[PDB]
């Protein structure tokens with residue numbers, strides 16, 4: 236009976252947008268996702284039969300502020316506004332006071348003065364504080380940065396991203412055949428699953444690969460973000476510099492991530508800036524793979540070092556080489572760790588459990 | 601204290617003209633923001649009141665440019681003073697984001713007969729939640745705000761103010777102006793507004809027909825593009841009743857105080873309730889008898905028989921009765937008119953009104 240108006244600024248399927256697919260699904264017969272840009276995320280939502288619409292600035296409030304006005308008027312036939320990004324929060328907060336509907340802010344970013352303008356930090360935080368009935372944080376790191384930026388602590392609740400655990404299971408044979416098709420059957424494959432961007436640190440994996448035995452190869456899965464083509468150029472040159480051209484594959488964007496992860500021997504998350512929540516980390520754990528992650532942000536809540544994956548100082552390529560080598564030398568311990576990771580991640584990040592937490596939290600408003 | 605005034609209109613309506621008086625004592629530390637260019641902008645410039653037009657051309661900068669520019673500007677000021685409905689909507693948004701107190705100066709009767717229920721709900725909700733203070737230009741405005749669901753405890757009535765001494769005209773200018781208009785020997789009923797059906801000129805004209813031949817009327821004001829059918833209807837009405845030599849259209853005039861003084865009665869005959877009859881007060885300050893339609897703000901401005909006359913809206917025979925009373929009891933009439941000047945100078949002196957505003961702002 237509760238109808239939700241979800242709002243997301245981006246027309247591109249980023250992590251938060253992908254998360255929103257899962258959040259919205261149980262509500263598809265009683266929800267709408269309003270976007271502020273068209274794009275492939277719109278396609279996806281349509282694929283999932285999640286009602287979706289694009290809200291633009293195209294022409295009393297109607298003329299003063301078209302976007303806000305459209306949101307306000309849509310909000311009238313909904314019971315709650317669920318804002319999924321920063322700009323959606325700003326617009327959602329205004330819409331909430333005008334349309335007289337409760338607001339939920341789902342926080343997916345680390346609200347950091349280094350990646351957000353102090354302008355937007357103050358505005359986002361103050362709007363949340365005064366108008367959000369609840370701020371869902373995707374991790375404790377996201378939670379504390381919100382608080383540190385002046386966010387009200389008592390408004391927050393941590394709810395992790397949820398995953399359909401059975402999608403991450405692949406047979407040994409499918410693994411073998413895919414590895415052959417990738418020509419890595421006799422390699423130690425380290426997989427990196429991220430859009431190519433400097434803060435994702437693919438260059439760190441490349442430097443580590445320089446200090447690894449020759450059987451170690453890398454697969455970079457993900458396409459280049461608009462404006463990062465300098466970075467992608469730096470990588471190719473970095474690689475050629477190091478003679479690694481035949482030991483690194485750029486697969487570009489891939490939708491078959493679980494299968495590709497299953498073909499790897501280790502999954503590496505090498506971000507140089509604190510990660511709010513690494514989806515790829517949890518995905519790798521669900522695939523039953525050893526995982527190594529930079530020791531900042533949400534990654535520290537996802538992995539316990541030595542138990543269900545490995546943590547390394549961000550930007551330190553040698554430390555990453557050492558974990559890679561330890562995985563190569565300590566076969567048994569590594570398999571155990573990887574098995575632990577599948578069990579713990581299934582318990583913690585099952586979409587069924589996450590959807591229950593979301594439902595409970597929403598109903599308690 | 602620096603004040604950011606906001607007003608939706610580029611045209612100098614009553615609210616906009618009132619804002620000139622309001623802003624003058626603060627003009628070295630204020631800005632008026634308009635949501636459209638026009639003559640009002642020119643008038644502000646004439647008075648050295650800093651002015652600026654905010655538009656929607658280009659993170660809120662992209663999402664809502666107009667709002668974003670107001671917010672941004674508002675950071676430089678200590679208070680946002682919204683003078684109209686739309687300025688309230690925008691100003692409330694800007695008020696929390698920039699973190700500045702907001703005042704709403706309500707110049708309108710928020711009637712569900714002249715505003716859609718959404719604009720009423722939105723204005724009332726925003727004011728109730730974000731206004732530190734709602735200034736109403738009259739008890740009529742105040743009570744309509746509250747009947748729409750406005751928070752009564754937020755309201756204070758502050759009337760429009762006038763420069764008292766502008767409404768004083770010598771008997772020699774009066775005689776000379778009556779001579780030039782050719783009304784020296786007439787009982788002159790003046791009507792001072794633009795030609796519009798809601799302003800009720802046709803009412804005065806029907807009353808003229810129930811009046812002795814020495815009663816003439818002067819209609820002072822021009823016509824709007826939109827009310828051209830009305831103008832022709834007036835001329836036809838005048839010819840049909842045989843009043844063509846007892847009505848003079850003077851067109852638009854800047855010397856209103858002087859023309860009021862040349863009248864013997866000033867007639868306010870609007871057909872719809874108004875928040876605050878500027879013309880009624882001006883007639884009082886000119887020391888003239890004034891008859892007004894008994895609705896809206898008029899009712900607060902006049903005590904019937906004491907300092908002017910109130911007549912049922914739309915009723916020309918009542919109006920004619922008043923006009924004939926003025927002709928027959930000249931002494932009672934001159935006393936009423938003298939009473940009018942004294943009470944209006946007391947209640948609507950801009951010096952006093954400015955003090956009420958200043959006091960009211962300092963309590964925030």
Ligand SMILES: O=c1ccn([C@@H]2O[C@H](COP(=O)(O)OP(=O)(O)O)[C@@H](O)[C@H]2O)c(=O)[nH]1
Nearest residue numbers: 250428429456457488489492512513514515
């Ligand atoms: O080629 C790719 C690369 C990534 N992803 C997905 O994109 C999301 C990236 O999320 P993450 O939280 O790891 O990155 P962020 O968006 O925080 O930078 C994950 O679900 C990945 O499985 C994908 O579908 N195809």
